[PDB]
């Protein structure tokens, strides 16, 4: 993974497609992503879970990702309705965040790099 959030997607590939390996048709050949968002209806409140693209909504801005450092950054892909094809491993996602932060972490170059990078403060 090039960035910390993708190491999450990678963590996600290890749980998600693990379920796929167990027979879960959903993750089977699916694109699974790490999204700190809501799960199933009864499984609300955002926690790091593994959501296959099936379950995310890219019409939702994913203010539940993590940037290169473990801070929740904004990137399109978030649970619109109750997510079914998902794995709540918030301990494990935030773990590779914590861990792979050694593989990617900036001193907060302002999360969500949409180019330009204008200083959000006037001295």
């Amino acid at each position: 993974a090039p960035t910390l959030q993708e190491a999450l997607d990678r963590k996600c590939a290890q749980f998600g497609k693990e379920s796929c390996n167990s027979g879960l048709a959903s993750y089977c050949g699916a694109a699974i992503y790490a999204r700190y968002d809501k799960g199933n209806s009864s499984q609300q409140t955002k926690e790091w879970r593994c959501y296959i693209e099936k379950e995310l909504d890219f019409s939702k801005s994913g203010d539940g990702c993590v940037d290169d450092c473990g801070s929740m950054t904004s990137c399109r892909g978030s649970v619109s309705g109750p997510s079914t094809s998902h794995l709540t491993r918030p301990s494990e996602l935030q773990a590779v965040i914590d861990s792979d932060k050694s593989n990617y972490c900036t001193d907060k170059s302002e999360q969500q790099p949409s180019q330009a990078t204008p200083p959000p403060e006037i001295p």
Side-chain angles (χ1 to χ4, degrees):
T3 61
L4 176 66
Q5 193 276 328
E6 194 168 299
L8 287 203
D9 280 16
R10 286 188 79 228
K11 183 55 64 156
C12 290
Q14 294 185 154
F15 304 122
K17 320 297 190 59
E18 156 253 89
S19 307
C20 137
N21 274 271
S22 308
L24 242 281
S26 284
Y27 316 104
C28 188
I32 190 150
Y33 305 99
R35 219 62 63 178
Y36 192 71
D37 222 284
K38 184 203 305 189
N40 182 30
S41 192
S42 308
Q43 301 308 92
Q44 71 296 143
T45 57
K46 305 210 187 198
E47 299 174 84
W48 278 117
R49 291 166 183 122
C50 304
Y51 302 132
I52 33 178
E53 181 177 279
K54 280 188 62 182
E55 307 295 306
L56 287 70
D57 182 15
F58 278 77
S59 191
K60 252 83 281 175
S61 54
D63 296 88
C65 317
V66 40
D67 207 276
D68 55 60
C69 7
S71 181
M72 55 194 63
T73 190
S74 313
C75 181
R76 280 73 104 149
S78 268
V79 168
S80 47
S83 180
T84 323
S85 313
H86 75 293
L87 293 101
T88 313
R89 315 275 194 197
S91 324
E92 258 294 90
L93 273 309
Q94 199 64 85
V96 10
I97 283 150
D98 179 79
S99 167
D100 271 85
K101 246 144 65 62
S102 313
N103 191 22
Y104 348 68
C105 165
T106 59
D107 296 89
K108 213 291 280 253
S109 46
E110 206 52 274
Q111 63 181 31
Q112 187 188 212
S114 185
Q115 298 176 89
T117 316
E121 182 60 289
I122 183 278

mmCIF file of all heavy atoms in Angstrom, residues 43-91:
data_model
loop_
_atom_site.group_PDB
_atom_site.id
_atom_site.type_symbol
_atom_site.label_atom_id
_atom_site.label_comp_id
_atom_site.label_asym_id
_atom_site.label_seq_id
_atom_site.Cartn_x
_atom_site.Cartn_y
_atom_site.Cartn_z
ATOM 1 N N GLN A 43 -25.829 -1.873 14.181
ATOM 2 C CA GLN A 43 -24.386 -1.779 14.376
ATOM 3 C C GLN A 43 -23.893 -0.365 14.082
ATOM 4 O O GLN A 43 -22.799 -0.181 13.545
ATOM 5 C CB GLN A 43 -23.642 -2.788 13.497
ATOM 6 C CG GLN A 43 -24.040 -4.232 13.748
ATOM 7 C CD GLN A 43 -23.968 -4.621 15.211
ATOM 8 O OE1 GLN A 43 -24.952 -4.509 15.940
ATOM 9 N NE2 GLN A 43 -22.808 -5.064 15.656
ATOM 10 N N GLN A 44 -24.750 0.620 14.350
ATOM 11 C CA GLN A 44 -24.446 2.026 14.074
ATOM 12 C C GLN A 44 -23.186 2.520 14.823
ATOM 13 O O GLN A 44 -22.416 1.716 15.343
ATOM 14 C CB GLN A 44 -25.653 2.920 14.403
ATOM 15 C CG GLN A 44 -25.958 3.082 15.879
ATOM 16 C CD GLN A 44 -26.370 1.802 16.590
ATOM 17 O OE1 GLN A 44 -26.008 1.584 17.746
ATOM 18 N NE2 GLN A 44 -27.178 0.976 15.944
ATOM 19 N N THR A 45 -23.009 3.852 14.875
ATOM 20 C CA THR A 45 -21.789 4.522 15.372
ATOM 21 C C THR A 45 -20.560 4.135 14.557
ATOM 22 O O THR A 45 -20.311 2.960 14.295
ATOM 23 C CB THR A 45 -21.514 4.313 16.889
ATOM 24 O OG1 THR A 45 -21.423 2.930 17.241
ATOM 25 C CG2 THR A 45 -22.592 4.976 17.723
ATOM 26 N N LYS A 46 -19.796 5.138 14.132
ATOM 27 C CA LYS A 46 -18.631 4.881 13.303
ATOM 28 C C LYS A 46 -17.531 4.196 14.088
ATOM 29 O O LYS A 46 -17.096 4.678 15.134
ATOM 30 C CB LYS A 46 -18.056 6.151 12.690
ATOM 31 C CG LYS A 46 -19.043 6.974 11.887
ATOM 32 C CD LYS A 46 -18.336 7.717 10.768
ATOM 33 C CE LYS A 46 -19.264 8.675 10.042
ATOM 34 N NZ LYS A 46 -18.721 9.068 8.713
ATOM 35 N N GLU A 47 -17.100 3.074 13.561
ATOM 36 C CA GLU A 47 -15.928 2.360 14.038
ATOM 37 C C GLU A 47 -15.242 1.800 12.825
ATOM 38 O O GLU A 47 -15.903 1.538 11.820
ATOM 39 C CB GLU A 47 -16.289 1.229 15.001
ATOM 40 C CG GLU A 47 -17.004 1.716 16.239
ATOM 41 C CD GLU A 47 -17.494 0.591 17.127
ATOM 42 O OE1 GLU A 47 -16.701 0.091 17.947
ATOM 43 O OE2 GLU A 47 -18.677 0.209 17.022
ATOM 44 N N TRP A 48 -13.931 1.667 12.879
ATOM 45 C CA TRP A 48 -13.207 1.115 11.761
ATOM 46 C C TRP A 48 -13.749 -0.247 11.398
ATOM 47 O O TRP A 48 -13.627 -1.205 12.150
ATOM 48 C CB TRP A 48 -11.732 0.997 12.062
ATOM 49 C CG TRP A 48 -10.981 2.266 11.879
ATOM 50 C CD1 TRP A 48 -10.316 2.978 12.832
ATOM 51 C CD2 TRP A 48 -10.825 2.978 10.654
ATOM 52 N NE1 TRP A 48 -9.729 4.077 12.257
ATOM 53 C CE2 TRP A 48 -10.043 4.106 10.925
ATOM 54 C CE3 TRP A 48 -11.272 2.761 9.348
ATOM 55 C CZ2 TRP A 48 -9.694 5.023 9.939
ATOM 56 C CZ3 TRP A 48 -10.931 3.672 8.373
ATOM 57 C CH2 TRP A 48 -10.149 4.790 8.670
ATOM 58 N N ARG A 49 -14.349 -0.327 10.249
ATOM 59 C CA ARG A 49 -14.877 -1.568 9.774
ATOM 60 C C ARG A 49 -14.410 -1.777 8.359
ATOM 61 O O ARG A 49 -13.932 -0.843 7.708
ATOM 62 C CB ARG A 49 -16.405 -1.558 9.842
ATOM 63 C CG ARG A 49 -16.952 -1.586 11.259
ATOM 64 C CD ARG A 49 -18.426 -1.233 11.294
ATOM 65 N NE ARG A 49 -18.950 -1.192 12.652
ATOM 66 C CZ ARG A 49 -19.521 -0.125 13.200
ATOM 67 N NH1 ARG A 49 -19.616 1.003 12.522
ATOM 68 N NH2 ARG A 49 -19.988 -0.179 14.435
ATOM 69 N N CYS A 50 -14.550 -2.984 7.877
ATOM 70 C CA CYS A 50 -14.183 -3.270 6.526
ATOM 71 C C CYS A 50 -15.449 -3.300 5.708
ATOM 72 O O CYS A 50 -16.346 -4.091 5.970
ATOM 73 C CB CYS A 50 -13.460 -4.619 6.463
ATOM 74 S SG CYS A 50 -12.012 -4.722 7.543
ATOM 75 N N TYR A 51 -15.509 -2.432 4.726
ATOM 76 C CA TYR A 51 -16.673 -2.306 3.880
ATOM 77 C C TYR A 51 -16.256 -2.534 2.454
ATOM 78 O O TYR A 51 -15.392 -1.825 1.941
ATOM 79 C CB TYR A 51 -17.283 -0.911 3.991
ATOM 80 C CG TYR A 51 -17.688 -0.498 5.372
ATOM 81 C CD1 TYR A 51 -17.322 0.739 5.856
ATOM 82 C CD2 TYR A 51 -18.439 -1.327 6.184
ATOM 83 C CE1 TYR A 51 -17.686 1.147 7.118
ATOM 84 C CE2 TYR A 51 -18.810 -0.931 7.452
ATOM 85 C CZ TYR A 51 -18.426 0.307 7.913
ATOM 86 O OH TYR A 51 -18.785 0.706 9.173
ATOM 87 N N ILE A 52 -16.822 -3.523 1.809
ATOM 88 C CA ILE A 52 -16.554 -3.695 0.404
ATOM 89 C C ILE A 52 -17.255 -2.604 -0.381
ATOM 90 O O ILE A 52 -18.245 -2.059 0.094
ATOM 91 C CB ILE A 52 -16.949 -5.075 -0.123
ATOM 92 C CG1 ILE A 52 -18.148 -5.604 0.598
ATOM 93 C CG2 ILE A 52 -15.799 -6.051 0.021
ATOM 94 C CD1 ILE A 52 -18.571 -6.939 0.051
ATOM 95 N N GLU A 53 -16.740 -2.273 -1.550
ATOM 96 C CA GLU A 53 -17.279 -1.194 -2.367
ATOM 97 C C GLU A 53 -18.793 -1.329 -2.515
ATOM 98 O O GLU A 53 -19.515 -0.332 -2.608
ATOM 99 C CB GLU A 53 -16.598 -1.187 -3.727
ATOM 100 C CG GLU A 53 -17.096 -0.086 -4.629
ATOM 101 C CD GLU A 53 -16.360 -0.051 -5.949
ATOM 102 O OE1 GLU A 53 -15.249 0.515 -6.000
ATOM 103 O OE2 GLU A 53 -16.892 -0.591 -6.942
ATOM 104 N N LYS A 54 -19.252 -2.575 -2.494
ATOM 105 C CA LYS A 54 -20.670 -2.902 -2.478
ATOM 106 C C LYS A 54 -21.444 -2.061 -1.460
ATOM 107 O O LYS A 54 -22.543 -1.577 -1.733
ATOM 108 C CB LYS A 54 -20.836 -4.384 -2.112
ATOM 109 C CG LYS A 54 -20.592 -5.345 -3.262
ATOM 110 C CD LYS A 54 -20.960 -6.773 -2.879
ATOM 111 C CE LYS A 54 -22.442 -6.894 -2.547
ATOM 112 N NZ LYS A 54 -22.814 -8.270 -2.117
ATOM 113 N N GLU A 55 -20.834 -1.885 -0.303
ATOM 114 C CA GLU A 55 -21.502 -1.346 0.870
ATOM 115 C C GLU A 55 -21.297 0.163 1.022
ATOM 116 O O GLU A 55 -22.054 0.827 1.728
ATOM 117 C CB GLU A 55 -20.959 -2.084 2.089
ATOM 118 C CG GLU A 55 -21.074 -3.593 1.940
ATOM 119 C CD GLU A 55 -22.507 -4.076 1.888
ATOM 120 O OE1 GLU A 55 -23.281 -3.740 2.804
ATOM 121 O OE2 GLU A 55 -22.848 -4.830 0.952
ATOM 122 N N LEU A 56 -20.274 0.705 0.373
ATOM 123 C CA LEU A 56 -20.003 2.126 0.456
ATOM 124 C C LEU A 56 -20.842 2.902 -0.536
ATOM 125 O O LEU A 56 -21.386 2.353 -1.493
ATOM 126 C CB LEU A 56 -18.542 2.439 0.166
ATOM 127 C CG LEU A 56 -17.533 2.076 1.247
ATOM 128 C CD1 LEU A 56 -17.402 0.582 1.341
ATOM 129 C CD2 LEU A 56 -16.191 2.680 0.903
ATOM 130 N N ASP A 57 -20.911 4.189 -0.297
ATOM 131 C CA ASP A 57 -21.530 5.118 -1.222
ATOM 132 C C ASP A 57 -20.546 6.226 -1.535
ATOM 133 O O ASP A 57 -20.135 6.972 -0.645
ATOM 134 C CB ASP A 57 -22.811 5.716 -0.637
ATOM 135 C CG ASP A 57 -23.513 6.655 -1.602
ATOM 136 O OD1 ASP A 57 -23.192 6.631 -2.806
ATOM 137 O OD2 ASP A 57 -24.394 7.420 -1.158
ATOM 138 N N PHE A 58 -20.152 6.320 -2.790
ATOM 139 C CA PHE A 58 -19.205 7.338 -3.217
ATOM 140 C C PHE A 58 -19.901 8.672 -3.449
ATOM 141 O O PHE A 58 -19.270 9.662 -3.820
ATOM 142 C CB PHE A 58 -18.469 6.881 -4.467
ATOM 143 C CG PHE A 58 -17.313 5.973 -4.169
ATOM 144 C CD1 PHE A 58 -17.512 4.637 -3.846
ATOM 145 C CD2 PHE A 58 -16.024 6.460 -4.225
ATOM 146 C CE1 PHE A 58 -16.439 3.804 -3.591
ATOM 147 C CE2 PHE A 58 -14.944 5.634 -3.967
ATOM 148 C CZ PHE A 58 -15.152 4.303 -3.653
ATOM 149 N N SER A 59 -21.205 8.695 -3.208
ATOM 150 C CA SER A 59 -21.955 9.936 -3.215
ATOM 151 C C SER A 59 -21.915 10.515 -1.811
ATOM 152 O O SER A 59 -22.384 11.621 -1.549
ATOM 153 C CB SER A 59 -23.386 9.713 -3.674
ATOM 154 O OG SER A 59 -24.039 10.947 -3.924
ATOM 155 N N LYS A 60 -21.329 9.738 -0.915
ATOM 156 C CA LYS A 60 -21.043 10.183 0.427
ATOM 157 C C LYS A 60 -19.566 10.471 0.523
ATOM 158 O O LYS A 60 -18.740 9.628 0.161
ATOM 159 C CB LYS A 60 -21.391 9.111 1.458
ATOM 160 C CG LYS A 60 -22.619 9.399 2.312
ATOM 161 C CD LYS A 60 -23.912 9.004 1.617
ATOM 162 C CE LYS A 60 -24.359 10.035 0.595
ATOM 163 N NZ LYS A 60 -25.563 9.583 -0.149
ATOM 164 N N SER A 61 -19.214 11.652 0.989
ATOM 165 C CA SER A 61 -17.825 11.948 1.203
ATOM 166 C C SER A 61 -17.360 11.217 2.442
ATOM 167 O O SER A 61 -17.950 11.348 3.518
ATOM 168 C CB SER A 61 -17.581 13.443 1.330
ATOM 169 O OG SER A 61 -18.405 14.020 2.331
ATOM 170 N N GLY A 62 -16.325 10.430 2.279
ATOM 171 C CA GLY A 62 -15.878 9.584 3.346
ATOM 172 C C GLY A 62 -15.036 10.335 4.334
ATOM 173 O O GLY A 62 -13.813 10.254 4.302
ATOM 174 N N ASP A 63 -15.688 11.075 5.213
ATOM 175 C CA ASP A 63 -15.006 11.739 6.314
ATOM 176 C C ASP A 63 -14.730 10.721 7.413
ATOM 177 O O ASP A 63 -14.727 11.038 8.604
ATOM 178 C CB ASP A 63 -15.858 12.890 6.860
ATOM 179 C CG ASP A 63 -16.080 13.996 5.847
ATOM 180 O OD1 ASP A 63 -17.059 13.919 5.069
ATOM 181 O OD2 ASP A 63 -15.287 14.962 5.839
ATOM 182 N N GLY A 64 -14.517 9.487 6.980
ATOM 183 C CA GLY A 64 -14.269 8.385 7.873
ATOM 184 C C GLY A 64 -13.128 7.530 7.368
ATOM 185 O O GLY A 64 -13.107 6.325 7.544
ATOM 186 N N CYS A 65 -12.192 8.154 6.699
ATOM 187 C CA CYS A 65 -10.985 7.473 6.264
ATOM 188 C C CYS A 65 -9.877 7.851 7.212
ATOM 189 O O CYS A 65 -10.121 8.462 8.238
ATOM 190 C CB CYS A 65 -10.627 7.908 4.844
ATOM 191 S SG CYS A 65 -12.045 7.995 3.737
ATOM 192 N N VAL A 66 -8.674 7.470 6.888
ATOM 193 C CA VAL A 66 -7.517 7.966 7.588
ATOM 194 C C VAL A 66 -6.503 8.368 6.563
ATOM 195 O O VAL A 66 -6.392 7.746 5.511
ATOM 196 C CB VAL A 66 -6.922 6.930 8.556
ATOM 197 C CG1 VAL A 66 -6.948 5.562 7.921
ATOM 198 C CG2 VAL A 66 -5.506 7.291 8.964
ATOM 199 N N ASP A 67 -5.803 9.427 6.848
ATOM 200 C CA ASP A 67 -4.842 9.952 5.912
ATOM 201 C C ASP A 67 -3.542 9.172 6.075
ATOM 202 O O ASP A 67 -3.577 8.013 6.491
ATOM 203 C CB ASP A 67 -4.668 11.445 6.160
ATOM 204 C CG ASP A 67 -4.243 12.194 4.913
ATOM 205 O OD1 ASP A 67 -3.035 12.222 4.614
ATOM 206 O OD2 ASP A 67 -5.129 12.743 4.217
ATOM 207 N N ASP A 68 -2.403 9.759 5.761
ATOM 208 C CA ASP A 68 -1.148 9.035 5.976
ATOM 209 C C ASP A 68 -0.861 8.916 7.466
ATOM 210 O O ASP A 68 -0.237 7.968 7.902
ATOM 211 C CB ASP A 68 0.050 9.648 5.231
ATOM 212 C CG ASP A 68 0.285 11.110 5.534
ATOM 213 O OD1 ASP A 68 0.518 11.451 6.708
ATOM 214 O OD2 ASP A 68 0.261 11.925 4.590
ATOM 215 N N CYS A 69 -1.334 9.867 8.252
ATOM 216 C CA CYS A 69 -1.270 9.760 9.690
ATOM 217 C C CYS A 69 -2.646 9.345 10.204
ATOM 218 O O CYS A 69 -3.639 9.546 9.506
ATOM 219 C CB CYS A 69 -0.870 11.107 10.272
ATOM 220 S SG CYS A 69 -0.800 12.453 9.066
ATOM 221 N N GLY A 70 -2.722 8.785 11.414
ATOM 222 C CA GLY A 70 -3.999 8.283 11.905
ATOM 223 C C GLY A 70 -4.903 9.404 12.362
ATOM 224 O O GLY A 70 -5.117 9.618 13.554
ATOM 225 N N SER A 71 -5.422 10.105 11.380
ATOM 226 C CA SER A 71 -6.411 11.136 11.559
ATOM 227 C C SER A 71 -7.446 10.932 10.473
ATOM 228 O O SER A 71 -7.085 10.693 9.316
ATOM 229 C CB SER A 71 -5.762 12.518 11.448
ATOM 230 O OG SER A 71 -6.709 13.554 11.643
ATOM 231 N N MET A 72 -8.717 10.977 10.829
ATOM 232 C CA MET A 72 -9.747 10.631 9.877
ATOM 233 C C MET A 72 -9.897 11.688 8.795
ATOM 234 O O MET A 72 -10.352 12.807 9.039
ATOM 235 C CB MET A 72 -11.061 10.328 10.563
ATOM 236 C CG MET A 72 -11.503 11.441 11.447
ATOM 237 S SD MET A 72 -12.841 10.979 12.570
ATOM 238 C CE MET A 72 -12.031 9.723 13.560
ATOM 239 N N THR A 73 -9.492 11.305 7.595
ATOM 240 C CA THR A 73 -9.466 12.201 6.455
ATOM 241 C C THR A 73 -10.693 11.978 5.578
ATOM 242 O O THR A 73 -11.409 10.982 5.737
ATOM 243 C CB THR A 73 -8.169 12.008 5.634
ATOM 244 O OG1 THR A 73 -8.034 13.041 4.654
ATOM 245 C CG2 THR A 73 -8.141 10.658 4.937
ATOM 246 N N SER A 74 -10.932 12.903 4.666
ATOM 247 C CA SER A 74 -12.115 12.867 3.835
ATOM 248 C C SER A 74 -11.796 12.327 2.442
ATOM 249 O O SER A 74 -10.982 12.893 1.713
ATOM 250 C CB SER A 74 -12.706 14.259 3.722
ATOM 251 O OG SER A 74 -12.795 14.885 4.992
ATOM 252 N N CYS A 75 -12.434 11.225 2.089
ATOM 253 C CA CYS A 75 -12.297 10.629 0.767
ATOM 254 C C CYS A 75 -13.561 9.854 0.442
ATOM 255 O O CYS A 75 -14.032 9.069 1.257
ATOM 256 C CB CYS A 75 -11.072 9.716 0.718
ATOM 257 S SG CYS A 75 -10.786 8.927 -0.883
ATOM 258 N N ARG A 76 -14.098 10.078 -0.752
ATOM 259 C CA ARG A 76 -15.430 9.595 -1.103
ATOM 260 C C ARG A 76 -15.539 8.082 -1.015
ATOM 261 O O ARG A 76 -14.757 7.355 -1.617
ATOM 262 C CB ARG A 76 -15.839 10.073 -2.492
ATOM 263 C CG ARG A 76 -16.333 11.499 -2.495
ATOM 264 C CD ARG A 76 -15.198 12.466 -2.319
ATOM 265 N NE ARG A 76 -14.830 13.124 -3.571
ATOM 266 C CZ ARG A 76 -14.331 14.355 -3.659
ATOM 267 N NH1 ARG A 76 -14.129 15.079 -2.562
ATOM 268 N NH2 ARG A 76 -14.038 14.861 -4.849
ATOM 269 N N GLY A 77 -16.487 7.627 -0.212
ATOM 270 C CA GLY A 77 -16.740 6.212 -0.075
ATOM 271 C C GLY A 77 -17.254 5.882 1.298
ATOM 272 O O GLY A 77 -16.499 5.447 2.142
ATOM 273 N N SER A 78 -18.524 6.073 1.537
ATOM 274 C CA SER A 78 -19.047 5.898 2.884
ATOM 275 C C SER A 78 -20.411 5.259 2.916
ATOM 276 O O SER A 78 -21.216 5.403 2.006
ATOM 277 C CB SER A 78 -19.090 7.239 3.607
ATOM 278 O OG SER A 78 -17.896 7.478 4.330
ATOM 279 N N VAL A 79 -20.634 4.555 4.009
ATOM 280 C CA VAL A 79 -21.847 3.812 4.246
ATOM 281 C C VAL A 79 -23.080 4.721 4.272
ATOM 282 O O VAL A 79 -23.281 5.495 5.210
ATOM 283 C CB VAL A 79 -21.705 3.029 5.564
ATOM 284 C CG1 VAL A 79 -23.031 2.454 6.033
ATOM 285 C CG2 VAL A 79 -20.655 1.934 5.399
ATOM 286 N N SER A 80 -23.882 4.632 3.216
ATOM 287 C CA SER A 80 -25.101 5.419 3.098
ATOM 288 C C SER A 80 -26.226 4.782 3.905
ATOM 289 O O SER A 80 -26.752 5.384 4.843
ATOM 290 C CB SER A 80 -25.494 5.540 1.627
ATOM 291 O OG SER A 80 -25.430 4.279 0.977
ATOM 292 N N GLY A 81 -26.587 3.567 3.528
ATOM 293 C CA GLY A 81 -27.538 2.799 4.299
ATOM 294 C C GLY A 81 -26.830 1.735 5.093
ATOM 295 O O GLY A 81 -25.627 1.565 4.931
ATOM 296 N N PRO A 82 -27.545 1.010 5.953
ATOM 297 C CA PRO A 82 -26.973 -0.063 6.769
ATOM 298 C C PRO A 82 -26.082 -1.015 5.972
ATOM 299 O O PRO A 82 -26.535 -1.677 5.036
ATOM 300 C CB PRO A 82 -28.197 -0.804 7.297
ATOM 301 C CG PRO A 82 -29.359 -0.243 6.538
ATOM 302 C CD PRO A 82 -28.978 1.157 6.198
ATOM 303 N N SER A 83 -24.820 -1.079 6.364
ATOM 304 C CA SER A 83 -23.848 -1.930 5.700
ATOM 305 C C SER A 83 -24.007 -3.368 6.168
ATOM 306 O O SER A 83 -24.073 -3.640 7.369
ATOM 307 C CB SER A 83 -22.432 -1.433 6.000
ATOM 308 O OG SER A 83 -21.457 -2.238 5.360
ATOM 309 N N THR A 84 -24.064 -4.287 5.223
ATOM 310 C CA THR A 84 -24.207 -5.687 5.552
ATOM 311 C C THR A 84 -22.893 -6.412 5.324
ATOM 312 O O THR A 84 -22.368 -7.062 6.231
ATOM 313 C CB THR A 84 -25.296 -6.357 4.711
ATOM 314 O OG1 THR A 84 -26.383 -5.442 4.503
ATOM 315 C CG2 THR A 84 -25.812 -7.601 5.420
ATOM 316 N N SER A 85 -22.342 -6.269 4.123
ATOM 317 C CA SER A 85 -21.078 -6.900 3.788
ATOM 318 C C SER A 85 -19.935 -6.124 4.433
ATOM 319 O O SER A 85 -19.296 -5.289 3.791
ATOM 320 C CB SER A 85 -20.892 -6.937 2.268
ATOM 321 O OG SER A 85 -22.065 -7.396 1.614
ATOM 322 N N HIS A 86 -19.668 -6.406 5.697
ATOM 323 C CA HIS A 86 -18.697 -5.631 6.441
ATOM 324 C C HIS A 86 -18.146 -6.416 7.627
ATOM 325 O O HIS A 86 -18.771 -7.358 8.108
ATOM 326 C CB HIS A 86 -19.330 -4.325 6.932
ATOM 327 C CG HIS A 86 -20.261 -4.488 8.102
ATOM 328 N ND1 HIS A 86 -21.460 -5.160 8.031
ATOM 329 C CD2 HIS A 86 -20.137 -4.091 9.391
ATOM 330 C CE1 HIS A 86 -22.030 -5.166 9.221
ATOM 331 N NE2 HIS A 86 -21.248 -4.527 10.071
ATOM 332 N N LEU A 87 -16.981 -5.995 8.096
ATOM 333 C CA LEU A 87 -16.351 -6.589 9.267
ATOM 334 C C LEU A 87 -15.906 -5.503 10.229
ATOM 335 O O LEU A 87 -15.061 -4.679 9.885
ATOM 336 C CB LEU A 87 -15.134 -7.423 8.864
ATOM 337 C CG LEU A 87 -15.440 -8.675 8.047
ATOM 338 C CD1 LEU A 87 -15.167 -8.423 6.574
ATOM 339 C CD2 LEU A 87 -14.636 -9.857 8.561
ATOM 340 N N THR A 88 -16.467 -5.486 11.425
ATOM 341 C CA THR A 88 -16.051 -4.520 12.427
ATOM 342 C C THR A 88 -14.745 -4.949 13.059
ATOM 343 O O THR A 88 -14.727 -5.693 14.041
ATOM 344 C CB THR A 88 -17.108 -4.328 13.530
ATOM 345 O OG1 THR A 88 -18.403 -4.152 12.939
ATOM 346 C CG2 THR A 88 -16.783 -3.121 14.395
ATOM 347 N N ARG A 89 -13.647 -4.498 12.482
ATOM 348 C CA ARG A 89 -12.352 -4.685 13.103
ATOM 349 C C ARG A 89 -11.720 -3.319 13.339
ATOM 350 O O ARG A 89 -10.675 -3.010 12.779
ATOM 351 C CB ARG A 89 -11.456 -5.506 12.175
ATOM 352 C CG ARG A 89 -12.137 -6.711 11.554
ATOM 353 C CD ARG A 89 -12.097 -7.925 12.464
ATOM 354 N NE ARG A 89 -12.458 -9.151 11.749
ATOM 355 C CZ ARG A 89 -12.822 -10.286 12.344
ATOM 356 N NH1 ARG A 89 -12.946 -10.340 13.664
ATOM 357 N NH2 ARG A 89 -13.070 -11.369 11.614
ATOM 358 N N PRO A 90 -12.299 -2.513 14.237
ATOM 359 C CA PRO A 90 -11.823 -1.159 14.470
ATOM 360 C C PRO A 90 -10.517 -1.157 15.240
ATOM 361 O O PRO A 90 -9.693 -0.258 15.092
ATOM 362 C CB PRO A 90 -12.960 -0.490 15.256
ATOM 363 C CG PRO A 90 -14.085 -1.469 15.287
ATOM 364 C CD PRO A 90 -13.491 -2.818 15.033
ATOM 365 N N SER A 91 -10.333 -2.197 16.036
ATOM 366 C CA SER A 91 -9.095 -2.407 16.761
ATOM 367 C C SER A 91 -7.955 -2.694 15.790
ATOM 368 O O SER A 91 -6.824 -2.261 15.986
ATOM 369 C CB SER A 91 -9.278 -3.594 17.702
ATOM 370 O OG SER A 91 -10.597 -3.612 18.223
#
